[PDB]
Structures are given as C-alpha cells and as structure tokens.
Amino acid sequence: AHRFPALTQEQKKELSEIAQSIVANGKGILAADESVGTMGNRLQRIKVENTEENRRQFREILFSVDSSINQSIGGVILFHETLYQKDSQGKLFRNILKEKGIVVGIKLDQGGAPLAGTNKETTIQGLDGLSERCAQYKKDGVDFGKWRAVLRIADQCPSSLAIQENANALARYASICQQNGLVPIVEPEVIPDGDHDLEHCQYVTEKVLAAVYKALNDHHVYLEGTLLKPNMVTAGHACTKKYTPEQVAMATVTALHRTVPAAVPGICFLSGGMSEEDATLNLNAINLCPLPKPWKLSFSYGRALQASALAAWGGKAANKEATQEAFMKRAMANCQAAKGQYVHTGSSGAASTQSL
Amino acid sequence: AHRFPALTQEQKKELSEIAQSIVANGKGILAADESVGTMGNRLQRIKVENTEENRRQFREILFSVDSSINQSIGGVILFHETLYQKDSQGKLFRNILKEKGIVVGIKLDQGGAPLAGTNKETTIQGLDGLSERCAQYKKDGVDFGKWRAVLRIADQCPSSLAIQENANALARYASICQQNGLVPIVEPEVIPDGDHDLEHCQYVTEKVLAAVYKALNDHHVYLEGTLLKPNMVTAGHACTKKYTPEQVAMATVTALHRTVPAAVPGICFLSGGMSEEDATLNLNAINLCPLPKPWKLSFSYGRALQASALAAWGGKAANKEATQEAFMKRAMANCQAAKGQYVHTGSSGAASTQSLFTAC
Amino acid sequence: AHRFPALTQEQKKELSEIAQSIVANGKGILAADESVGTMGNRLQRIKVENTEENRRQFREILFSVDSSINQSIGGVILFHETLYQKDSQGKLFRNILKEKGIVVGIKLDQGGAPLAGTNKETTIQGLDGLSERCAQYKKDGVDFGKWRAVLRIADQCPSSLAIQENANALARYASICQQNGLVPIVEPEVIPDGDHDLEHCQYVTEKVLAAVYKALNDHHVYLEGTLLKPNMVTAGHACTKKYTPEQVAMATVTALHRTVPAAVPGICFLSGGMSEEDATLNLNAINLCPLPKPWKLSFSYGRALQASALAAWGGKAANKEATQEAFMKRAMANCQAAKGQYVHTGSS
Amino acid sequence: AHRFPALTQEQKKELSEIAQSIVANGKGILAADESVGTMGNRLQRIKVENTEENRRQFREILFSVDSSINQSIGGVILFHETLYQKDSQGKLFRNILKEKGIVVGIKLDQGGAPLAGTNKETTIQGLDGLSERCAQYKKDGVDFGKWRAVLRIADQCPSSLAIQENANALARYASICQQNGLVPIVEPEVIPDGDHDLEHCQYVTEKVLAAVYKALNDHHVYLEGTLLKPNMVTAGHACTKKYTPEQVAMATVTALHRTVPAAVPGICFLSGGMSEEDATLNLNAINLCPLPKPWKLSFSYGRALQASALAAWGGKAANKEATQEAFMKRAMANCQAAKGQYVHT
C-alpha cells in the first residue's frame, strides 16, 4: 500500500528487458532445476544412481551443446548446486550458458509444507532470507527465478486456504525478486493427478489464476517484469476420455485469456509429465488457437525437453552425442511449437511418445 | 460453487455476439441515459426547461438522424423514461433505433447510497428486482445494460470498503444481466474531482480494476459477454500539471492492460467532463499507444457526443438540422478515433472546446 | 474509511440501550414476523384460511395477553403489515405492545434471490431504499430490525461466494439500521436440511460466523448495538444419530465462543423446526454449558412459542384463552431456559 | 480442506492445558527473549558491555530467584541462545525454570522484512522450516511459542497489505506451532510511535485484531490453545494529551472485547515503552474495567519487569540480591494487577 512506488523506471526497464528477452522469437526455457531428489527420480528411470557426479555429468552434456541452441532456448533455470558446478576444466556451467547467449535462472522456492486442516494440501517455503539470496544470485550472474506452487483437485482441494495462501507466497516471492533485479517466474501448477476431465481443470485453473493475479496486484508486483508458468489445461491423469491438442488448446487459452493480464509478456507452460511429443503438439495448437492471445505462449520444459536425451545417455560418457542430439531436437521442436510452426516431425522413438 | 455452470453454451454465444456487435468496426456507444436530474443540468446549460417533453424532443432529433449513424454508433443506452417514449408520430424510440441497426441498452443502476463510517463514499442501489426488470426489458427489445459506480480520490478515498462493496455490487449486477440475455456494461468510474496528478489516478484506477475483475470472477460472470466502461487515466480536475493525449494514453493503456482481461471484447470510455475534442484526441491516442491492446478501445460518450448538438438545438425545433449535424459530426470523429485515425486538425468549434455538462 | 466515524457517542448509547433492553433478564423474542405465505403455512397446519383478517386475529390474541408477559418477552418482531394493523378497536398493535413494556421490531429483508453459478444458493434482497424505510419505522415506534440470510450444507454449499455475499448484505443492512436508530438483529441461518451430523454443522456454523463478524467489522458496524440470531448447532434433519441437549449445547456454545465477540450483548437462538419442548431444553442446556459465555443467551422464536397456541385457537375466537395460555406458557419456559433455570422436566 | 481436522482432541487437550496454566492464577509472563541487539540497548542503559557473558549472567540472577516467583510468573519467553545456556553450575536455565514450575517458551519469529510499495512497512520472517524447529524445541523442554508482528500508525500505515500479510504470517505460524504441541502466543503489536491520540490507536487496534482473528480462522488455528499478546490502547508517544489508566483501560477492553474471541484463554499485554509503574497501573485498571472480559488479562512483560532490577545489578555480581528483589517486586505487583488488586502504598 499506497503512493510509495515499489520500483524505479530503471528497475522496470531492466526487468521488462530481461523478461522479454527469454521468450523473444519462439524461444523458451529449459527447466533443469530438478532438485537432488527429483533428479534421482529421473536418473532412476534410466537406472543411474543419483550421485552429484552423475547429475553433473548429464547437465554438462546438455549445457555444452552448440551455441546454435541459443535459437530455441531463451534461459535455463538451475537448481542451487548446479548453479555452482563446473565442466571438465572447471568452467562453471553458469558461465558456459551466459557466454552462449542464454539467460540463467534459479530455483528460489524450497518446497512444500503441509497446511493443517486440509485434505493433504500444502504451501511453499523459501521466503526467509530470499532477498539476500536473490542479491547474491544477481551478483553470481542470475537474472530470473522460479517458485513452484502445487495445487490438486481431490476431496475438498484446491481449498481456499490453499489457493489464497499459495497465491500470497508467490506474491511475496515475486515482490522480493523484483527488488533485486530478478524476473520472477510464478508457477501455480495445478497437478494433473486424478480422474477429473477437461472442464474441471479449466475451471480450477481459472480460479487459481484469478487469485494469483489479484494477490499479485495487492503486493504491487510489476507484471511486465514477470513470467507465468502455468499448467496447460487438460483432463487428469486418470481421466479416461481422450482429448486433442486442439481441445487442450481452446480450454487452455480460454482460461488464460480470462485471467492473465496482457501486461504479462510471456506464458511458458510446465509440461509435467506429458510425453515430449504431446508437450510440443499441445504448445503448437496453443499458438494457433483462434482467441485473443496478448502474450508470447512458449515452454519451460523439464521432462519434455530431457527424456529422450536421458535415455540416449543412459549414464555413459560415450553417448554424449546422442544425448546432445535429442535435447537439440526437442529444443528446436518446441521453438517451432512456440511459433505455431511445428508439424508432426521431431523425435520418434518410444521416449518422445513416452509419457512422464 | 463449481460444476454448477451459470450459463449454457448457447447463452454465452448470445451475449458474446451482442457484446462484440456493439464495438465492431470502430463503432461506439451513445450514452443518452441521463436521468431527469442529470438531463436537467444539461439543458440548464442551454437555458431550456427540463421538461419530459423537452427531453423527448432533443432525443427525437438525435435518434431520427440519418441511418448512416449506424456506421459510428453501435448501441445507445437509454434511461427508463426514454425507453418508452415516442417520436412525433407515435413511433417508439426503441423501435426507431432498432430498425436502423443500432443495439439498445438500458441504465439499470439506481443511484448511490452512502457508506457509513467512510469519508463521503457511496455504493449503488438497484439490485432488488433486477432480474424481473431485465427480463422485461429484454422482452422490450433491450440487449445490454449499464451500471455506474462512483469512486473518488481524497482524504481516505477510495477506501477498501468502498472499492470492495462497489465491485461486489457491480458483480451481482453483471451476474443478473447475464442470466437474462443482457450484456452488462460495467462502469466503475474513478472521478476526476480533485488535484491529484496522472500518476495517482493511474494507481487508483489499477486498484479499482483489479478488484472489479477478481470480483466478477468470484461471481462467475462471463467476461466474453461484458463491456467495460471505465475512466481514461487523467489528472484531477484541479490538478495544474498539463498533459498530452499521448501522456493520457500511456497511463490509460498501461493500467488497463495490467488489470482488464483479454476476454473482455471491448472497453468504451466514459468521457466524464473532457471537452468533445479532448474526448476525441484522447481516445485516438489510446488506439495508437504502443502497448498490448487485446480489446476494442472505443467510446461510450454522454457529453462528448452531445455538447455541440445541444447548443445548436437551443431547444428550438427549427434547429433540427444543425442539431443533427453536430451529433453526427462528433459520432463520426469518435469512430475514427476508435480506430486510431482521427487526425483532427485541433478542433475549432467553441461548443466542442469548452468544459462539459453540469459536470463538476 | 479511517476516522470518519460511523455514529456518535449518543447513537451508540441509544442503540446499546435498545440492544440490552430486549434480553434484559432472562427475556426473549417473539418472532411474529412471518410473511403472508409463511404465516399461511402455519395457518394451513390448523386448517385455517390464510386471510389478512385470520392473521390479524391470531396475533391480536397473542398481543393482547396479560401485561405480565413483559417479564418473559422483551421484544416482538413484526412483519410490515402487522405493524399497521389494529385490534377490534382501532388500537394499533404497535401501541398495545409498547404500552405493555415490549420493544417492537421489524422484519427488513425481502426474501431470497438466486446466486448464479451455485448449487441453488441465494442471497437476500432488501437494501434498495432500506434507509428510508428505516427512518419511517423508527418514526413509527420500531426500535430494532431483523434480516435473515439462509445458508445450507449440501454438495458444494455453503460456498464461499454464498457466505461472503450473504455476510456482506447483512453487514450493509446492519450498518444501515444504525444510521437510523434501529439495533439490527443479524440472522445468518444455517438450515438443518440434510443428513449431516453435529460436528459437520459446528464446523460450517463456525465458518459462517467468522465471516459475518469480519464483515460487520469492515462495515464499521457497532457490535454493542447489535443482536444475533444464529441457528443452534444440531445434526441435520435427516441425520440418523441422536444427541442430547447437553451435546447440542456444547457444540453450540463452542462455536459461538470462538466466533461472536463479547461486545455483542445478546445472541437469541432461532429454533425453526425444533419442537417447543426441545427449543426450551436446548436453550436451557445452552445456558448451563460450562464454556465462557460473555453474552446473554436467549430465544427469538416463532414456531416454538406459538405452535400450541395456534393449535388451541383453531382459528376460533372462542379459543382465545386457551390460545393465550399456551403462548404464555411457552414464553415462561423459555424465559427460565434463558436463565438456565428451567428445571425443565417436561411442561405441556 | 475443510472437515479433515487440524488437531485431535488429545492435541487440543494438551495445548489448552498449557495455554491456561500459564495465566492461571493471576499469573503472567516474563519476556526475557530480547535478542542480542535489543539486550545490547538495555545494557547500554546501565553501562555494561553487550556480552553473551553479561547477557548470560544477568538472566541467571533473574532465573535463580526464589521458587516463590512461581506465584506470579507462569512462564518465560527465551531467546534461542539462552534456551541452551547454563547457570554457574552447568545447570541449564530452562531446567532451572521448569523445576520451579515455570513453563518455558521460545521466540520463533525471525525479525522483519520490507514490504515493497509501502511507506516503510514490514512483515515478519521465520516460517521457513519452522515446524522442524518447533519439534526440536518441544524436545528441548519448550511448551509455547512467540511471534511478534509490528504495525505502525503513519502516512498510509498501517496498510491493507501490511495488515493482511502480517495476519497471514501470524496465522501460518500459529498453525505450525499447534501441529507440534507448542502454544502460539500471537503478538500483533501496534507500535506507539508518533503523534496520534488514543481513539486513533484504538481504531487501528481494532482493525488489526479483526484481521488477526479471521485469518487464524481461515487457517484452522485452535483458539482455546493460543494466547494473545497485544498492545494496550494508548496515545502515541509524541501525543501531548495526558490520559488516566482508566482511560487506557476502557479503550483497550473496548477494543479487545469487540474483536478477540472468548475462546482465547488469556491476553498478555506487552507494555513496550511504559514505565514499570504505569505498566502495573494500566494492567490493574484493565482488570477493573466495567465491560465483559471473557479472558484472563495479564502481563507478558520485558522492560516493565526488568528495569529496576537491571539498574540495581549494574552488571555487578555483588548486586545479586538487590537485582532479584526488584524483579521479584514487579513480578508481584503485576500479578496483583492481573487480579485488579494492585494498590500503590
């Protein structure tokens, strides 16, 4: 509250410049910020032991790919550890990435915490000392952050305490990052677990984005210097009905265009477990849906950009190339999807049609 | 909650089609819904008695204008009296408007009500009976409604209680229109009274808007089936900073693109006191503002479409012609401005250059 | 707003007096404000034609009772019509009651209205013109008002929209009434329909009270000048478990002590549906419940104070005495219950 | 959810019992949870070097006072370092207190954070990982917590954002304490800084509290196992109008009874800034105030119980008895004031 402006014109100019730079010409985001535990889950699928070193090795293969990768990839979100890791010749990754023209980002949330008196719902931690962490990250070469909330549809979820309380941690999160020069990505993911259908997700997704944006305003957040990583709108995991990229597209741009201000510059979708192929086909329909779409509609993918590469790697140095090839192909595909230019092409083996 | 949808797909299709038809090709709205008191203030300016007959005569001139007016005017908001008045031959005004291909709206709000413990802030009455009233008006040829809220800037204004309550009332109101096939026009006006500058206005307006839409969302309103009639972002009346349309537009378009969703099909500005030429220069500047503009940006003009015609009328039937040319001239200019093409020469036309219409 | 006080010290004094006057000493509230249709449902039970004369005749009997009765009833809520009716002699009922020592109140809401996009939830209508209406009633010798909201437990009810919207209308009405000297009686009723149990209603009643209060607070309503008429914590109508007055008391005072500020002078249960005997025992248990109870706990009953009286009247003049007797009886039981005396042991 | 209870009845039962036992018979709380910096200020006053030794030493005099202080003091708020500090004989202070029948509490908040876009307003940090800390503290002898939010009166403060956000932080914290068997003392202080008068402070005190309690209600906090530590209502510090204890009381009780729920078992007024005597007089009055008072009304004082003792100590070990005397004296005065039985003489 009121008068007493959160930011200078200059601060805004910087954050709006970073933000627009990452989704600039069909480019997207590679989401490599899996934590120790989450990355172990990934490495498990290819039966690779979750070691720091293995983690360092897979990331180094992805980050050392030809600078051309700049033409699909606008930023890369890193987990803390990886932010401080290095190459073979300790070139820190973060500098391998900045030098190729890629903007570096950082996971700033520190996970869930249960919210008592609720059907298993949570909020997210990490606001304590966030300012000071953001400043050091700004110093170490980071220009955007990521904060993920997780909301479920189930008996009595997403509760109100749940949507408002996760919308306000997001809003504090967003507020602090801006005071430090980082563009905040607000991730209010609504989890595809369960058997609801398309309309149900569409509705919850609309009620969750309306909360976020009003919280977001109550806390004086600067929409122009922010990015949204929403869930696309689909039926749940256990839904038996079958849907089309085009139906996911309508439901998804419908929901957004009723709740996401045109000032937000770019909307980069989470892929969450869709196969790589669907991730791409869906984003591509999203860019051709015949509705008002005032922002860039792009990707911030984690699994949809790294499954087939993980699989080609299998933890063997010897696979460097195949690993590289995979990620590059997914990366290009999502760039065309980002421009509504993708045509069923791209990666084809079971891992692209995988499901995650 | 949820899975209790408020509208069917076919009700949505109808409100969306209505709502877009009104702002379709640079068109705008003529806001002729001044109540008796308000209208009295207007006619007082031209020293004409505020008679139900004087009122019916000045509106007869305006609506009997050449057909071509439907190139500029996509809809016309009427005050209850007027919705039931007649031409000089017993032909109903609402039927004349409707045959010339112009959508008819009706003022649904019923004035303010003081908010106790507030520094002179109000809310707006009109929801009791609202449904039974829209139903009937729909039957009577009406396809859209208008509800005006009034917020001001001042010591302890606009408060949370006032913003909150006026958004909710707006909320109920838009809900109810939608259930009866009327497209709600939502007008949370921020008045220009006072000396704040543009930056302050812009901030209150972003504040007001964000509450409005979250509220409409709580109430399940169908945005696609709505129109928004807000104030342009300007300095207060008594502020002394002088600004440029272009400054006006940057503030306006900035605020609106951070709170009004892209699903709203059009936003028709009230002109609230701005000279006829200024309401034209501004709207025009808003259409060329280099920011995202997902929605039509047009006019819904009370005074700014009528100053000149009133003055020409003088309350004399022999002035019919002049009266109609004034009206038509501002209706066309406005529609060009709604398309970012009004390259007025600064207007000459005192009528058009002066403050406006027992305003304050 | 922020300074800009709602009311003066004197308005306050006035309203605070009204408020405490009506629940002053064990007494309670006769809710005779049934509406035309509602009142006819009551007449239908005893097979009497809903007619304005039938209605004026019934109340006439209830209001002509032995003065006394200002030692149990401290206020009587009337439906508009009844406010301007007479007795079999032009005496205006509103004068008969004043002169008996009883505060007369008016129903100010105007029934429900559907909230689109809800599972059949409603709001209430009535604020348009309320202010004007309030001024005249105050001038016609009404000192307090009543507005009922209805909330229900059901698939996705009560919704947050429902609760929020109902609490705000209630806050508008309550602010409005003070501005014209009535003390507003805030009635957010959680209907018993359905099969939920006690603890489900407790939870839903404690959430609805938190809402209303919060709103009253936003609307700068003067609580010390108010009165509440909440439902009692009970299992739903279709619940098959069975419970004890004392179990309804604990459920009820628990909820109320967690949400209704000690500044509200009195909370006056509605009974809607409970037999005459139960509304007296539960109120009674309510007053014996061992929690902290900063406010008077009492009744503001409609059926529970009249059902037997109607039965006795039968719409027959001849039945007058029987009729008053009954009403006079239930009114003492509940005064005594209001004091936690009512040694109970079943009455009529 | 809704339904899906936050606590079992057992859990309630314990939090309830702990909550009441602290305010049990006119008893109150010694707040010795000043941080290293704050304590520094207080020692600055008697001219003693802010030293963990000094700190440690000064508290050791207050906690070794005769057991009879448990007639007046129901619990003590410690700051982290101190929760693990020992006497001159290696006996941990918390055990010394626990053995004289005093319940021990831990500061949980972690200070302030700037709320951009506000006129100097803040929120409070400390929720990250708070649960695992709660549990740890529970295992180290702790039974209740403490979280201080600060609001002030000034140009555009306290704002909606400040209000709502501190309320939400308070709610969360309260909730997480309950989940781990501590009783959360909610502390929404309205700072006295500034020129405002009585009625103003009372108006903000009422808005802050209605916000505090609805948010605890959104967050399923169980009030019967909570305590509230609010400011009393008084004019601001630079306000020239003089007022009587009776005036402070009517304004404090008026506010409190309009917003704080009768379930809350006890309300323990911070005194911030009040002289020891004024803190006793005003609490006393508060207890005679002729309005409904469903809750004990006591103290949770820091300066008000230690000023005279600190001056007597003078950082001189030889002043051990004077030092304890003073402290003991205010603790009894406040205990009487918590029973509206204090009189000067």
PDB file of N, CA and C in Angstrom, chain D residues 271-310:
ATOM      1  N   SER D 271       4.084  -4.234  27.172  1.00  0.00           N
ATOM      2  CA  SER D 271       3.968  -2.964  27.835  1.00  0.00           C
ATOM      3  C   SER D 271       4.772  -1.940  27.031  1.00  0.00           C
ATOM      4  N   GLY D 272       5.638  -2.533  26.175  1.00  0.00           N
ATOM      5  CA  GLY D 272       6.515  -1.741  25.352  1.00  0.00           C
ATOM      6  C   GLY D 272       6.620  -0.286  25.778  1.00  0.00           C
ATOM      7  N   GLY D 273       7.722   0.172  26.353  1.00  0.00           N
ATOM      8  CA  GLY D 273       7.765   1.645  26.478  1.00  0.00           C
ATOM      9  C   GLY D 273       7.146   2.202  27.752  1.00  0.00           C
ATOM     10  N   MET D 274       6.082   1.597  28.294  1.00  0.00           N
ATOM     11  CA  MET D 274       5.525   2.006  29.583  1.00  0.00           C
ATOM     12  C   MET D 274       6.454   1.871  30.795  1.00  0.00           C
ATOM     13  N   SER D 275       6.436   2.867  31.702  1.00  0.00           N
ATOM     14  CA  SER D 275       7.292   2.726  32.914  1.00  0.00           C
ATOM     15  C   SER D 275       6.875   1.505  33.711  1.00  0.00           C
ATOM     16  N   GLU D 276       7.711   0.904  34.516  1.00  0.00           N
ATOM     17  CA  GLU D 276       7.196  -0.258  35.300  1.00  0.00           C
ATOM     18  C   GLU D 276       5.837   0.006  35.933  1.00  0.00           C
ATOM     19  N   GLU D 277       5.674   1.151  36.607  1.00  0.00           N
ATOM     20  CA  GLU D 277       4.502   1.518  37.421  1.00  0.00           C
ATOM     21  C   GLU D 277       3.320   1.727  36.463  1.00  0.00           C
ATOM     22  N   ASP D 278       3.610   2.531  35.405  1.00  0.00           N
ATOM     23  CA  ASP D 278       2.459   2.678  34.513  1.00  0.00           C
ATOM     24  C   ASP D 278       2.008   1.317  34.024  1.00  0.00           C
ATOM     25  N   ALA D 279       2.929   0.404  33.761  1.00  0.00           N
ATOM     26  CA  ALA D 279       2.530  -0.910  33.257  1.00  0.00           C
ATOM     27  C   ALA D 279       1.707  -1.670  34.291  1.00  0.00           C
ATOM     28  N   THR D 280       2.062  -1.472  35.535  1.00  0.00           N
ATOM     29  CA  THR D 280       1.233  -2.110  36.593  1.00  0.00           C
ATOM     30  C   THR D 280      -0.101  -1.390  36.715  1.00  0.00           C
ATOM     31  N   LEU D 281      -0.158  -0.087  36.846  1.00  0.00           N
ATOM     32  CA  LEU D 281      -1.410   0.631  36.959  1.00  0.00           C
ATOM     33  C   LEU D 281      -2.386   0.323  35.807  1.00  0.00           C
ATOM     34  N   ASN D 282      -1.885   0.376  34.586  1.00  0.00           N
ATOM     35  CA  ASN D 282      -2.778   0.174  33.460  1.00  0.00           C
ATOM     36  C   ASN D 282      -3.250  -1.271  33.459  1.00  0.00           C
ATOM     37  N   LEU D 283      -2.420  -2.233  33.842  1.00  0.00           N
ATOM     38  CA  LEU D 283      -2.978  -3.570  33.790  1.00  0.00           C
ATOM     39  C   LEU D 283      -4.095  -3.744  34.840  1.00  0.00           C
ATOM     40  N   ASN D 284      -3.797  -3.154  35.996  1.00  0.00           N
ATOM     41  CA  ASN D 284      -4.732  -3.160  37.098  1.00  0.00           C
ATOM     42  C   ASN D 284      -6.080  -2.622  36.662  1.00  0.00           C
ATOM     43  N   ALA D 285      -5.999  -1.423  36.059  1.00  0.00           N
ATOM     44  CA  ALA D 285      -7.251  -0.774  35.620  1.00  0.00           C
ATOM     45  C   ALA D 285      -7.992  -1.680  34.663  1.00  0.00           C
ATOM     46  N   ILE D 286      -7.194  -2.146  33.713  1.00  0.00           N
ATOM     47  CA  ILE D 286      -7.686  -3.066  32.680  1.00  0.00           C
ATOM     48  C   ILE D 286      -8.484  -4.091  33.476  1.00  0.00           C
ATOM     49  N   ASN D 287      -7.947  -4.593  34.591  1.00  0.00           N
ATOM     50  CA  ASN D 287      -8.787  -5.619  35.216  1.00  0.00           C
ATOM     51  C   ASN D 287     -10.028  -5.129  35.937  1.00  0.00           C
ATOM     52  N   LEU D 288     -10.015  -3.841  36.335  1.00  0.00           N
ATOM     53  CA  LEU D 288     -11.309  -3.396  36.915  1.00  0.00           C
ATOM     54  C   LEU D 288     -12.280  -2.865  35.880  1.00  0.00           C
ATOM     55  N   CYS D 289     -11.954  -2.784  34.623  1.00  0.00           N
ATOM     56  CA  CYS D 289     -12.796  -2.120  33.644  1.00  0.00           C
ATOM     57  C   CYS D 289     -14.154  -2.751  33.535  1.00  0.00           C
ATOM     58  N   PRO D 290     -15.161  -1.942  33.691  1.00  0.00           N
ATOM     59  CA  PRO D 290     -16.520  -2.429  33.691  1.00  0.00           C
ATOM     60  C   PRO D 290     -17.097  -2.819  32.334  1.00  0.00           C
ATOM     61  N   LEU D 291     -16.615  -3.826  31.672  1.00  0.00           N
ATOM     62  CA  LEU D 291     -17.090  -4.315  30.362  1.00  0.00           C
ATOM     63  C   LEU D 291     -16.963  -5.828  30.415  1.00  0.00           C
ATOM     64  N   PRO D 292     -17.551  -6.596  29.558  1.00  0.00           N
ATOM     65  CA  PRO D 292     -17.369  -8.050  29.546  1.00  0.00           C
ATOM     66  C   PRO D 292     -15.928  -8.437  29.342  1.00  0.00           C
ATOM     67  N   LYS D 293     -15.367  -9.378  30.083  1.00  0.00           N
ATOM     68  CA  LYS D 293     -13.947  -9.724  29.906  1.00  0.00           C
ATOM     69  C   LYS D 293     -13.813 -11.215  29.912  1.00  0.00           C
ATOM     70  N   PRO D 294     -14.168 -11.929  28.865  1.00  0.00           N
ATOM     71  CA  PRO D 294     -14.202 -13.367  28.991  1.00  0.00           C
ATOM     72  C   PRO D 294     -12.874 -14.016  29.250  1.00  0.00           C
ATOM     73  N   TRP D 295     -11.712 -13.412  29.123  1.00  0.00           N
ATOM     74  CA  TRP D 295     -10.406 -13.970  29.231  1.00  0.00           C
ATOM     75  C   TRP D 295      -9.483 -13.573  30.324  1.00  0.00           C
ATOM     76  N   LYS D 296      -8.496 -14.332  30.896  1.00  0.00           N
ATOM     77  CA  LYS D 296      -7.692 -13.594  31.917  1.00  0.00           C
ATOM     78  C   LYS D 296      -7.160 -12.328  31.251  1.00  0.00           C
ATOM     79  N   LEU D 297      -6.531 -11.420  31.917  1.00  0.00           N
ATOM     80  CA  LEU D 297      -5.932 -10.241  31.281  1.00  0.00           C
ATOM     81  C   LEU D 297      -4.717 -10.010  32.160  1.00  0.00           C
ATOM     82  N   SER D 298      -3.605 -10.346  31.486  1.00  0.00           N
ATOM     83  CA  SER D 298      -2.422 -10.334  32.257  1.00  0.00           C
ATOM     84  C   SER D 298      -1.247  -9.665  31.652  1.00  0.00           C
ATOM     85  N   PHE D 299      -0.056 -10.099  32.165  1.00  0.00           N
ATOM     86  CA  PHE D 299       1.075  -9.449  31.506  1.00  0.00           C
ATOM     87  C   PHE D 299       2.014 -10.439  30.820  1.00  0.00           C
ATOM     88  N   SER D 300       2.843  -9.931  29.879  1.00  0.00           N
ATOM     89  CA  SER D 300       3.929 -10.749  29.296  1.00  0.00           C
ATOM     90  C   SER D 300       4.961  -9.630  29.087  1.00  0.00           C
ATOM     91  N   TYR D 301       5.670  -9.224  30.141  1.00  0.00           N
ATOM     92  CA  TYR D 301       6.445  -8.014  30.155  1.00  0.00           C
ATOM     93  C   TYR D 301       7.945  -8.290  30.090  1.00  0.00           C
ATOM     94  N   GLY D 302       8.619  -7.319  29.497  1.00  0.00           N
ATOM     95  CA  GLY D 302      10.055  -7.472  29.480  1.00  0.00           C
ATOM     96  C   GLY D 302      10.684  -6.271  30.216  1.00  0.00           C
ATOM     97  N   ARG D 303      10.408  -5.058  29.688  1.00  0.00           N
ATOM     98  CA  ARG D 303      11.107  -3.953  30.386  1.00  0.00           C
ATOM     99  C   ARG D 303      10.478  -3.744  31.782  1.00  0.00           C
ATOM    100  N   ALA D 304       9.169  -3.649  31.773  1.00  0.00           N
ATOM    101  CA  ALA D 304       8.300  -3.480  32.873  1.00  0.00           C
ATOM    102  C   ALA D 304       8.660  -4.462  33.975  1.00  0.00           C
ATOM    103  N   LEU D 305       9.275  -5.624  33.662  1.00  0.00           N
ATOM    104  CA  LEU D 305       9.716  -6.434  34.805  1.00  0.00           C
ATOM    105  C   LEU D 305      11.215  -6.361  35.050  1.00  0.00           C
ATOM    106  N   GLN D 306      11.949  -5.567  34.277  1.00  0.00           N
ATOM    107  CA  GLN D 306      13.365  -5.784  34.496  1.00  0.00           C
ATOM    108  C   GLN D 306      14.045  -4.482  34.695  1.00  0.00           C
ATOM    109  N   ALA D 307      13.403  -3.388  34.462  1.00  0.00           N
ATOM    110  CA  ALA D 307      14.200  -2.155  34.516  1.00  0.00           C
ATOM    111  C   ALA D 307      14.898  -1.847  35.815  1.00  0.00           C
ATOM    112  N   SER D 308      14.076  -1.980  36.845  1.00  0.00           N
ATOM    113  CA  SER D 308      14.624  -1.592  38.155  1.00  0.00           C
ATOM    114  C   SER D 308      15.652  -2.626  38.557  1.00  0.00           C
ATOM    115  N   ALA D 309      15.428  -3.887  38.259  1.00  0.00           N
ATOM    116  CA  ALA D 309      16.407  -4.935  38.539  1.00  0.00           C
ATOM    117  C   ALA D 309      17.724  -4.745  37.777  1.00  0.00           C
ATOM    118  N   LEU D 310      17.632  -4.260  36.544  1.00  0.00           N
ATOM    119  CA  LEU D 310      18.859  -4.105  35.752  1.00  0.00           C
ATOM    120  C   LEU D 310      19.713  -2.999  36.342  1.00  0.00           C
TER     121      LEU D 310
END
